Design a protein around this ligand. Structure first.
Ligand SMILES: [Zn+2]
Lengths: 1320, 652
DNA sequence: GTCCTATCGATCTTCGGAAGAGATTCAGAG
DNA sequence: CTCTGAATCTCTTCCCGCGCGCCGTAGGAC
């Protein structure tokens, strides 16, 4: 085992047992790998913009006799990178350029073109791009598009009991759902009549489709029914008997011949009867005419002489009909098999309901019912029918849709065309009829084998296709009417439809979620989020328990714990840890390939449908280190059912115990001991924690942090191995070792760490370094810790020392008692960065100005303002201070005053100004500062690179004519022709000299371009001239009313900041920080937080022993002696660490990083048992009970009986009180109705709902109601007269009449209604 | 209205009127120019459809829109609807002089007080402060008074402390299903920003303090203040209007303290001595010479009010515990000692409090409740009843009970392996055997929990009730009933599929032990089913409430006696064999319909129109009366109202 | 560029609501 | 031949607050 340098600082003790055979994959690959499939061109045009184009192009005008065809598309590089684009507020996108080849053919000649015009990649639109963190920048705002989950295209069969007519019976209905086209549903009437409908239109007979498919009633009957034959030879009407057709049914009539009678009238038929009959050659048998009368014929049979219909398809025969038709010369009669249980007449029943006759009749009826108000026509009914289900423009089964369809039809082949075929619909109907006969099973709609996941690279593709369809619609007409001679492909198309479509999708779609950048965990769990909502899906208000409830196939693919409880439980899901999306779009999960009696180290991915065909061993099964199941019989799940199976019968095994959970639940320790409700609450709350100021580490984790913090994209990660050369908390420069250095490149890699920057939740996301100058790093190591991360491990909150006890009721049932020490240590203080903008527009009366010469203001408020009229950076401000000196023409004192309540430090001011208007002085100063910084950055880059390059040149010049005097004589730049033989060293020198010249020119051009960009007058788009941005930093501490929470679903607002004296202290004098309530533990069944607390105590105890051994100058050999014992303790744990190889330098470093408690890992379902917790407590001098006796600080008495004390990891949730406390006396009033405004950002009052009115009426309070609904809110005249009296001290109201009511009257008086007040 | 920049916000009605005006002007222009009949007919149809879109947009074939398929709101749309005027601005309207904040529990408050932040008090009582600044003469007018208030001058805080002296504030939590969700409180200034709420009141609001926001409204006029103090004050709402049940039922933490204080142990420090009075007993505890659960003889004195209503003092020696003798110093001077001579729990205490309201009255009852809360909190803090993994006990026989029970299922499987049983019978035998095993496991676990305590009384071991933390939490009724401790220490038991089928293989583990992956996945079914049930039923409940209020809003008690003599006969509910509720519950608080007869013949017992209060209910239960006809609101013959005699007792 | 008129006056607006209530048709029904 | 059945049509309805946060006339003629 080898430990990486980032890992080789805190060797977290692990209590796992199973060896993790497959490491957790990249957690954001769900996004990128999808968008990667989108932007990349592919000769297999499918899955990309090339697929979208081929689905549209080539496009031709039939009247025009000329086409234009797509050639290729090349994507221009983004104009602005992520940082600049976010700062300025533009979108991060790329320009799309498409080669269109306009070919003009010639009339009276073959398609030999007169001329073809290939446009050089004409501009087509701007498509947004996915940043490497997996997010899109649309308007500076950073967005994440959730992957959607919906029903896969194909055919689905469903039936219900009670929901339809309640009469015991179930109605079977089949649906055909194309990927893009019209729905087609077949259904059975309660009287077994089969009908069809399109897009849930009116019911139409099913057979009409076959009439549309040009099938005669004879053809249909032959397709669907079986033939039973009667002959008029050797006897009157003998029957061809098929003995298997008679089984179970009572033989209700005589059948006897050839000696022995098989079955007489009135008896059933069994197998031995069938065998006797088969021996009897029952090809012809005697039946009475009555049995022959009940049949229905299969074919038309006309009078051969007169040529008139004597029998027709589906015509029911009778004795006289039989005699007549046989006399006419049709001696071989064929009838339909119509066994009630087996061969129902459903198609014939539809025939009886059919009012149509033939293909013309079918088309007429289809046209009339499809388009009321539209007259049918032979040439147009085809234009409707073919477009319905056979034309590519309005029908296309996707590849996955066709695969699922063929699977549903048990076809041998899955590669089929997207358009339906006659045999396809015939097979669908046949399966439907078989299901009606009961020879099949209905599918499950909410089964993961029927619902597939659409991601960004598919929804964006569909939106692009919609845009291209609109563009084709326009340009087909343009080419039909265009002269085709002066036209060029740029004239044919305009970007506007495509640009608008993609822009709307990426800006305001239902799935273009605004990112909740509260912390790295929120980012990851939002990027891997799965939604059943959105277009083409269901809605939060029209879904029932069926789709919400969990499913036996969710195992290994969807987290059953992390769902947003509330309005949309079960509709928004989080993808499991190991799950990945199949090629077709389904979710597949890896299972260990179990071979015979051994569990191999071979991972095969199984989908939701394949999993039923196997038997899967649970991941908790033990193996004998040879791969064999130690248990003779092992519990396994086969078809949703789970039960025991014998060894060497199982076929697969889950790859890890964490395969069932998601990252949010994976981070929670002791998840096995928590009731699922509290697990859900903890998982939901963990992503709401605000990044504290000094987040350090969790004492008890699950080891998932080492991945969640790395893959979040918020921590600076070493791209290549090397040695650190310089760090200044802003830029970490690494000397990447030559083993991975490009021969011509710099060989030195910068890392410009991001400092305090506002997040989507108004939090700071600065990254701080953790490596030291000269420290070696390897590729993938975390260099700089981001927010909520420290030393490469995710750390949302702080580990507080908590005790479980009632304390005078200040922890009453949700409340939390917090010692003053934790607020003295700045345990929970956090920075909030608010952004306030002061805009200025070129109004109709003249252009506005920003100036310190504002009218009607004294120098008191101007003290913070500068000579230009903007606050000096670093000035501390409070609510009401002027931050911007704007003036409006014709003058008015419109200026940005700080919003009430908030107060903090102004740390940034960016002023974006539209040019033409002169720039204010401070804008000039800020621009000059930016330009100086950019020039300094570029110059430092070039000069450090020049130093490295010149040093390399001198190193090359060491061998090959080294001359120290001639080398240090001249400046290093005049080394063009230094003394060196006619070898390849001079060639390397010339190569590096050309490289240096290229670096010179690149430095020059980049500097000039950057200067032009910064000096550019920023585009203030809608009639606006200048905007000034201000950023305020508020260092919010923790106060009563703030909300804290554990990881085990325990939450509550802190009720008192108890001073240090009043807190309980143990016999060592150490006071506890937080006093929790015990009664909440047994009620909500979240016992996990208890055990963790106990373990946490031991986790600190080890540290308490190390710190002393560090405080006391122990010799390292002894120190190591202790630490190794703390690591080798436990069962046969998976992790094994030998501290000997640490050379005592890494030992001392680890101790310096361990003296604050040894971090411990407790995997989700492979966690530490109580025995190991007791053993670890025994290693320290701590009590093995877990409970200690405490002393009340106020009275010095000892609490009766010991109490539980430990270190619980607590998180400050983002629901602090100062964002929610509000009160209104008098202020803004709404216009249409004079009721007060509503909200916090507006000075509004609380809404007095109808329930409150009912409650007031429940008491006898009438004056209270009258005041509350007339004076306080509605009566404009009254609420002033009340104001005067209250100031005057009269306390009397004049109610009048609520103005809103009068408005209602006008709304009714605006109609043809005369409603008015009355006197008497 | 304009928006940011030189543009005006789109108005729905304006566009409909514009369409109508344009179409009508076109029709007028044509009719002036004599357009052909076809054209004028088409214009008239378009005008009619435009008027249709203006009036009730949506009743047309398709609503018109000027955006991404967002139909325009019409006049009829604005009139009705959940966002319409009726339910948006008339029935419920936003009110000035109100605010909201996150609440927190202040145990020091009296029953009739609540703490509010100084900032919120200043921002709600602003005009009242002005009303003093002029009256004090400290400010010239409003112009200087507002400035001084902004200056937050230290004198302004004195003005606030004078204004807020006796001015009630209304507190209501959203939602407010019943009238007890809105109450008046006398405010007290608090430094912080959270609203200090009383513990005993939090039950009425259903207020968990896990970040729960709550709103305050300031009654301004004189009549509003008086109405708040007389009808909505906390101390005026001690009985629930839905049934004769107090709403000040002792909280979860307080009852734990009382249960811990009054419990008795076999052998304890300070046992068996004689105490001259309750006060001395307290001293002993605070000097540390005696244990709270020690058994002792203290001289008790109690007062009993005669039939006329004057207290009679009686003093005696009583065998009791030190905790009970200490608590007796709080119980008012009208109750028997037998109420406190027992280990009190959330049930046993409640009737106690109720008995006070039955005897002493409202004013003694409220102070007694406050003292009970104080004592409970203090002695629960002294208890330190922590909870730990050591307290969850797994009975040792459990492994055997499983090892046998599964084997029995094997036998039921063996029959299925031999064809000796049907498919369904195997299922319904296995599930029943598992249920019996679960019952055995639960009984063994409970027996072990209570038996885990055995103590030596000067010689030989003797068992007693268990001081186990979980056991005291469950037995006191605070939290964690038997179904909780059974899942925490017995076995989780059977589960159900989303289709409701009983799982053949129960969750044989308990949360103290680890649940495996499959067991947790099985539990997720029931967890999500319950969560979805809550999220879906929270809407139907509210809709039913709205229907009820809008069907019954008219009825008011508007007359004393209607004079009728009919009614409805009340009998105990006897169904499924034994009775499910007594006669007293039905008939208490109503008036008799006719003269109540003695059990037998020709002898009456109660007058024909007498209210059957508690004493007469006891008198009836003394006799063998099962059917009693009493007047009912349905039968009362009062026009456009309901007579008072039919409705009877006001339950609050 | 400004400012205009008009609003699928050559499409297909979504199929993942349930129910509950009338209102409106039809159907043997004499 | 309609009457007095069902059956098949359309319309109405769906808890309370509270916060974020974006997003918000269009194409065509002088
Ligand atoms: Zn009455």
């Amino acid at each position: 085992m080898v430990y990486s340098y980032t890992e080789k600082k805190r060797i977290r003790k692990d209590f796992g047992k199973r060896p993790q055979v497959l490491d957790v994959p990249y957690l954001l690959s769900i996004q990128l790998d999808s968008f990667q499939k989108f932007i990349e061109q592919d000769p297999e045009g499918q899955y990309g913009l090339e697929a979208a184009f081929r689905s549209v192009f080539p496009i031709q005008s039939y009247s025009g006799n000329s086409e234009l065809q797509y050639v290729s598309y090349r994507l221009g590089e983004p104009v602005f990178d992520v940082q600049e684009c976010q700062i300025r507020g533009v979108t991060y996108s790329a320009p799309l350029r498409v080669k269109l080849r306009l070919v003009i053919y010639e009339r009276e000649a073959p398609e030999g073109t007169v001329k073809d015009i290939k446009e050089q990649e004409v501009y087509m639109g701007e498509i947004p791009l996915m940043t490497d963190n997996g997010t899109f920048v649309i308007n500076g705002t950073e967005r994440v598009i959730v992957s959607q989950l919906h029903r896969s295209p194909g055919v689905f069969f469903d039936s219900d009991k009670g929901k339809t007519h309640s009469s015991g019976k179930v109605l079977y209905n089949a649906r055909i759902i194309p990927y893009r086209g019209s729905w087609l549903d077949f259904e059975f009437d309660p009287k077994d009549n089969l009908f069809v409908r399109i897009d849930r239109r009116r019911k139409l007979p099913a057979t009409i489709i076959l009439r549309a498919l040009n099938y005669t009633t004879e053809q249909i009957l032959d397709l669907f029914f079986e033939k039973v034959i009667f002959e008029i030879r050797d006897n009157k009407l003998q029957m061809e008997l098929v003995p298997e057709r008679l089984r179970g049914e009572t033989a209700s009539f005589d059948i006897e011949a050839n000696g022995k009678v098989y079955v007489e009238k009135g008896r059933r038929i069994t197998a031995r009867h069938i065998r006797q009959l088969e021996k009897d050659d029952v090809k012809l048998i005697e039946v009475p005419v009555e049995y022959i009368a009940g049949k229905v014929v299969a074919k038309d049979y006309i009078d051969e002489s007169t040529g008139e219909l004597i029998c027709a398809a589906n015509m029911e025969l009778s004795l006289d009909l039989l005699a007549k038709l046989s006399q006419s010369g049709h001696k071989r009669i064929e009838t339909l098999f119509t066994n009630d249980l087996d061969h129902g007449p459903y198609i014939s029943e539809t025939l009886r309901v059919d009012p149509t006759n033939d293909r013309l009749s079918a088309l007429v009826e289809i046209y009339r019912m499809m388009r009321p108000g539209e007259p049918p026509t032979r040439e147009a009914a085809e234009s409707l029918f073919e477009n319905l289900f056979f034309s590519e423009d309005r029908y296309d089964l996707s590849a996955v849709g066709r695969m699922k369809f063929n699977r549903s039809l048990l076809r041998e082949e899955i590669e089929g065309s997207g358009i339906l075929s006659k045999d396809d619909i015939i097979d669908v109907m046949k399966k439907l009829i078989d299901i009606r006969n009961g020879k099949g099973e209905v599918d499950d709609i909410d089964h993961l084998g029927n619902r597939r996941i659409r991601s960004v690279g598919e929804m964006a593709e569909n939106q692009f296709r919609v845009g291209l369809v609109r563009v084709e619609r326009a340009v087909k007409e343009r080419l039909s009417l265009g002269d085709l001679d002066t036209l060029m492909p740029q004239d044919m198309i305009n970007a506007k439809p495509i640009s608008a479509a993609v822009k709307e999708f990426f800006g305001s779609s239902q799935l273009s979620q605004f990112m909740d950048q509260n912390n790295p965990l929120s980012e990851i769990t939002h990027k891997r989020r799965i939604s059943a909502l959105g277009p083409g899906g269901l809605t939060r208000e029209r879904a029932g328990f069926e789709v919400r409830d969990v499913h036996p196939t969710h195992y290994g693919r969807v987290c059953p714990i992390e769902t947003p409880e509330g309005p949309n439980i079960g509709l928004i899901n989080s993808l499991s840890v190991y799950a990945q999306t199949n090629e077709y779009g389904f979710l597949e999960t890896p299972y260990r390939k179990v071979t015979d009696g051994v569990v191999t180290d071979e991972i095969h991915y199984l989908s939701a449908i394949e999993e039923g065909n196997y038997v899967i061993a649970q991941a908790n099964s033990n193996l004998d280190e040879e791969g064999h199941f130690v248990e003779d019989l092992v519990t396994c799940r086969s078809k949703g059912e789970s039960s025991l199976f014998s060894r060497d019968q199982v076929d697969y095994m889950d790859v890890s115990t964490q395969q069932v959970v998601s990252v949010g639940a994976s981070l929670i320790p002791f998840l096995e001991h928590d009731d699922a409700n509290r697990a859900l609450m903890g998982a939901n709350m963990q992503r709401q924690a605000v990044p504290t100021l000094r987040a350090d580490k969790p004492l008890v984790g699950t080891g998932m942090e080492r991945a969640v913090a790395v893959d979040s994209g918020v921590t600076a990660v070493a791209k290549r191995g090397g040695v650190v050369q310089y760090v200044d908390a802003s830029r970490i420069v690494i000397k990447v070792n030559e083993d991975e250095m490009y021969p011509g490149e710099a060989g030195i890699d910068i890392y410009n760490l991001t400092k305090y920057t506002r997040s989507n939740q108004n939090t700071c996301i600065n990254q701080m370094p953790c490596v030291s100058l000269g420290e070696p790093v390897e590729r993938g190591d975390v260099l700089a810790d981001g927010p909520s991360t420290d030393l490469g491990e995710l750390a949302l909150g702080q580990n507080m020392r908590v005790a479980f006890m009632p304390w005078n009721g200040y922890n009453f049932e949700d409340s939390i008692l917090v010692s003053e020490r934790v607020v003295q240590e700045d345990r929970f203080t956090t920075i909030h960065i608010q952004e306030l903008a002061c805009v200025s527009r070129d109004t109709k009366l003249g252009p506005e100005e920003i100036t310190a010469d504002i009218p009607n203001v004294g120098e008191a408020a101007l003290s913070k303002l500068d000579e230009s009229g903007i606050v000096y950076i670093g000035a501390e401000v409070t609510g009401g201070d002027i931050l911007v000196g704007k003036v409006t023409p014709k003058v008015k004192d419109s200026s940005l005053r700080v919003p009430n309540g908030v107060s903090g430090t102004v740390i940034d001011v960016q002023v974006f100004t539209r040019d033409g208007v002169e720039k204010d002085k401070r804008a000039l100063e800020i621009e000059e500062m930016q330009l100086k910084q950019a020039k300094k950055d570029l110059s430092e880059e070039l000069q450090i690179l020049e130093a490295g390059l010149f040093s390399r040149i001198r190193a090359v010049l060491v061998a090959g004519g080294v001359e120290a005097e001639k080398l240090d004589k001249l400046p290093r730049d005049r080394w063009l022709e230094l003394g060196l033989t006619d070898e390849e060293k001079q060639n390397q020198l010339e190569q590096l000299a050309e490289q240096y010249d290229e670096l010179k020119h690149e430095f020059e051009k980049k500097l000039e371009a950057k200067r032009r960009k910064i000096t550019q007058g920023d585009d203030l788009a809608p009639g606006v001239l200048k905007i000034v941005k201000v950023y305020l930093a508020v260092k919010r501490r923790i106060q009563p009313g703030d909300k804290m929470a554990g990881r085990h679903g325990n939450k509550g607002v802190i009720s008192k900041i108890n001073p240090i004296e009043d807190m309980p202290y143990d016999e060592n004098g150490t006071p506890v920080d937080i006093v929790l309530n015990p009664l909440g533990v047994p009620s909500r069944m979240n016992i996990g937080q208890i055990l963790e607390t106990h373990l946490g105590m031991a986790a600190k105890g080890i540290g308490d022993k190390i710190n002393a051994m560090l405080k006391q100058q122990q010799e390292v050999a002894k120190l190591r002696e202790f630490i190794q014992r703390a690591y080798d303790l436990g069962a046969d744990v998976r992790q094994k660490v030998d501290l000997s190889t640490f050379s005592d330098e890494e030992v001392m470093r680890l101790a310096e990083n361990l003296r604050k408690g040894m971090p411990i890992a407790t995997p989700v379902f492979d966690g530490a048992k109580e025995a190991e917790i007791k053993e670890l407590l025994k290693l320290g001098d701590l009590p093995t009970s877990g409970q200690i006796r405490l002393y009340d600080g106020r009275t010095g008495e000892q609490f009766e009986r010991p109490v539980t004390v430990g270190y619980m990891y607590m998180l400050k949730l983002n629901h602090l009180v100062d964002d929610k406390m509000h009160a209104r006396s008098t202020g803004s009033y709404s216009l249409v109705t004079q009721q007060p405004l509503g909200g916090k950002a507006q000075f509004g009052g609380q809404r007095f709902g109808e329930m409150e009115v009912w409650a007031l009426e429940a008491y006898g309070a009438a004056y209270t109601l009258q005041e509350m609904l007339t004076v306080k809110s509605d009566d404009v005249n009254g609420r002033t007269k009340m104001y005067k009296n209250i100031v005057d001290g009269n306390h009397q109201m004049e109610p009048g009449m609520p103005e809103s009511f009068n408005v209602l009257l006008k709304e009714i008086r605006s109609l043809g209604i005369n409603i008015e007040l009355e006197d008497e | 209205v304009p928006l940011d920049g030189g543009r005006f916000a789109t108005s729905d009605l304006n566009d409909l009127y514009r369409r109508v005006i344009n179409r009508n002007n076109r029709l007028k222009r044509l009719l002036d120019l004599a357009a052909p009949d076809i054209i004028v007919r088409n214009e008239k149809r378009m005008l009619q459809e435009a008027v249709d879109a203006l009036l009730d947009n949506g009743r047309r074939g398709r609503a018109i829109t000027g955006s991404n398929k967002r139909p325009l709101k019409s006049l009829a749309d604005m009139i009705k609807g959940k966002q319409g005027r009726f339910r948006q601005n008339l029935l419920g309207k936003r009110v000035d002089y109100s605010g909201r904040s996150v609440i927190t529990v202040g145990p020091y408050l009296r029953l009739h007080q609540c703490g509010l932040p100084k900032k919120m008090a200043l921002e709600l009582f602003k005009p009242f402060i002005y009303g003093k600044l002029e009256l004090r003469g400290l400010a010239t007018t409003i112009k200087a008074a507002k400035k001084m208030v902004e200056r937050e001058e230290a004198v302004v805080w004195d003005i606030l402390d004078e204004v807020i002296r006796e001015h009630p504030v209304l507190l209501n939590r959203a939602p407010t299903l019943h009238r007890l969700g809105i109450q008046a409180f006398e405010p007290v200034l608090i430094e912080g920003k959270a609203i200090q709420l009383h513990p005993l009141v939090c039950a009425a609001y259903n207020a968990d303090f896990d970040g729960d926001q709550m709103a305050v409204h300031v009654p301004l006029t004189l009549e509003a203040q008086l109405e708040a103090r007389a009808l909505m004050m906390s101390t005026n709402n001690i009985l629930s209007p839905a049934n004769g049940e107090p709403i000040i039922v002792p909280s979860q933490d307080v009852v734990l303290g009382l249960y811990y204080m009054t419990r008795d142990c076999v052998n304890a420090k300070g046992e068996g001595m004689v105490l001259t009075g309750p006060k001395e007993a307290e001293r002993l505890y605070r000097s540390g010479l005696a244990s709270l659960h020690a058994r002792v003889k203290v001289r008790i004195t109690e007062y009993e009010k005669d039939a006329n209503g004057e207290l009679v003092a009686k003093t005696s020696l009583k065998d009791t515990t030190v905790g009970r003798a200490i608590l007796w110093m709080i119980v008012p001077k009208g109750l028997p000692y037998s109420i406190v001579n027992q280990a009190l729990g959330k049930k046993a205490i409640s009737k106690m409090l109720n008995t006070c309201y039955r005897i002493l009255g409202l004013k003694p009852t409220v102070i007694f409740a406050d003292q009970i809360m104080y004592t409970g909190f203090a002695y629960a803090a002294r208890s330190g009843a922590s909870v730990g993994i050591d307290d969850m006990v797994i009975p040792e026989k459990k492994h055997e009970i499983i090892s046998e029970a599964e084997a029995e299922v094997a036998e039921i499987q063996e029959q299925f392996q031999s064809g000796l049983v049907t498919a369904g019978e195997r299922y319904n035998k296995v599930i029943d055997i598992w249920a019996a095993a679960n019952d055995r496991v639960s009984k063994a676990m409970m027996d072990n929990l209570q038996t885990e305590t055995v103590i030596n009384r000067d010689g030989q071991e003797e068992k007693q009730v268990s001081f186990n933390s979980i056991y005291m939490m469950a037995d006191s009724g605070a939290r964690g009933s038997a179904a909780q401790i059974r899942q925490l220490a017995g076995m989780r038991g059977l589960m159900a599929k989303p289709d409701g089928s009983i799982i053949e293989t129960p969750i044989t583990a308990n949360f103290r032990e680890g649940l495996n992956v499959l067991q947790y996945f099985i539990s997720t079914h029931g967890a999500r089913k319950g969560l979805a049930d809550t999220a879906l039923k929270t809407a139907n409940s509210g809709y039913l409430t709205r229907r009820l209020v809008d069907v019954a809003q008219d009825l008011v008690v508007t007359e004393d006696d209607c004079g009728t003599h009919e009614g409805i006969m009340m009998t105990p509910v006897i169904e499924g064999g034994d009775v499910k509720e007594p006669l007293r519950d039905r008939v208490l608080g109503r008036v008799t319909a006719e003269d109540v007869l003695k059990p037998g013949t020709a002898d009456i017992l109660v007058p024909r129109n007498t209210l059957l209060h508690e004493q007469w209910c006891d008198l009836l239960e003394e006799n063998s009366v099962d059917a009693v006809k009493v007047r009912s609101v349905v039968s009362c013959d009062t026009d456009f109202g309901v007579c008072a005699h039919c409705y009877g007792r006001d339950l609050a």
